[PDB]
Amino acid sequence: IHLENVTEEFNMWKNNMVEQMHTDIISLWDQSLKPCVKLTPLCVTLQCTNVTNNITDDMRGELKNCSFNMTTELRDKKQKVYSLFYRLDVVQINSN
Amino acid sequence: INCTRPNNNTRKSIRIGPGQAFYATGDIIGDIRQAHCNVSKATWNETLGKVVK
């Protein structure tokens, strides 16, 4: 609905309700995660190498290719599996 | 503004245990290129002229 003559002052900088918006999005983000799986048994020693690529020596690989151990559906069997990762997710533990 | 990643990717499902799925990144079919973004030249220069003015 529109109004005539009445004139009010506003201030974006001490305005409220933005604070509760920044609260609410964080709370919605956290509520959208607890029904999903944890990734605890994944922190394990990774055997890694370079992906198959004709690499110039001065350039670095953006993809690393790693293999490791993981528990199967049972508790007794364990299997060897491989995957890909970016360089910004693995670091060097400290021959091989 | 356009942005794109061109590398074709294949997901893969490892099982952790009873009823737990986990998604790796499998094979890569194609050449390894680099994901990037494009914008137009003259529109960007003209809008920067606007904000300078």
Epitope: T52 | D31, Q34
Partner: antibody
Framework: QVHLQESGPGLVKPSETLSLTCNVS????????WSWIRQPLGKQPEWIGY???????NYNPSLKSRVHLSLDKSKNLVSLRLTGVTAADSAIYYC??????????????????????????WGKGTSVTVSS | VSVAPGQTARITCGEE??????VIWYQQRPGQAPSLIIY??????SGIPDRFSGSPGSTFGTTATLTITSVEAGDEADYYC????????????FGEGTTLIVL
């Protein structure tokens, strides 16, 4: 019109320095990327390498140390030197010219492209046999 | 590898494709010097005849072919592929020969 000529001694003692020369016709040695090619009987031929002025002299990383390609701008020839030829290098040899080119797939500025070569014209060949 | 005269034969050579590749096809008559046929994937130099079908380079996970149509007795030549992939290093040796035995 162009044609070439392989030339070599042919009978080399084991562990010895081999040399080879390649004669030109018409097109001078400055113009073209040159190449040497080795082939034994019933085998795929082996690209020994390519040579040109201004550092365009990348070699085969198989041998890479005991072999020296070179040119001859005075007499307009193509020269090959080896060192320590053993019994494995019994083959016929070929000099050639080549034409290069660009293959481009992705972004140009990010070096997502490479160069290729192909040897257009061939020489005659020389049956170098290493023997004691 | 044998077909009737005037026909088309199918000739493949080398590894499966990985990325964008550039292929080179060379031929060689016996006793003589080597010789070019196809320099890009489907391009041939001037002075060379047609009817030599090559493969496109965009297809991934395939094998490079070479189809000869309207064959003859003069086409009896040892063939050599030379692949260049954008993922594998530089092949300093040539591919395996596929000798044709014409009818």
């Amino acid at each position: 019109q162009v044609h070439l000529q392989e030339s070599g001694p042919g009978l080399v003692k084991p562990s010895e320095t081999l040399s080879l020369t390649c004669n030109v016709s018409g097109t001078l040695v400055r113009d073209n990327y040159w190449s040497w090619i080795r082939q034994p009987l019933g085998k795929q031929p082996e690209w020994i390498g390519y040579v040109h002025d201004s550092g365009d002299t990348n070699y085969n990383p198989s041998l890479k140390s005991r072999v020296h390609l070179s040119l001859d701008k005075s007499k307009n020839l193509v020269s090959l030197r080896l060192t320590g030829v053993t019994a494995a290098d019994s083959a016929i040899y070929y000099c050639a010219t080549t034409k290069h080119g660009r293959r481009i797939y992705g972004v140009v500025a990010f070096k997502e492209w490479f160069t290729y070569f192909y040897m257009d014209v061939w020489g005659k060949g020389t049956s170098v046999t290493v023997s004691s | 590898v044998s077909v009737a005269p005037g026909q088309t034969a199918r000739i493949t050579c080398g590894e499966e494709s990985l990325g964008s590749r550039s292929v080179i096809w060379y031929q060689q008559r016996p006793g003589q010097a080597p010789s070019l046929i196809i320099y890009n994937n489907n391009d041939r130099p001037s002075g060379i005849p047609d009817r030599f079908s090559g493969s496109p380079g965009s297809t991934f996970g395939t094998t490079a072919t070479l189809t000869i149509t309207s064959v003859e007795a003069g086409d009896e030549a040892d063939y050599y592929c030379h692949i260049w992939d954008s993922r594998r290093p530089t092949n300093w040796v040539f591919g395996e020969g596929t000798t044709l035995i014409v009818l």
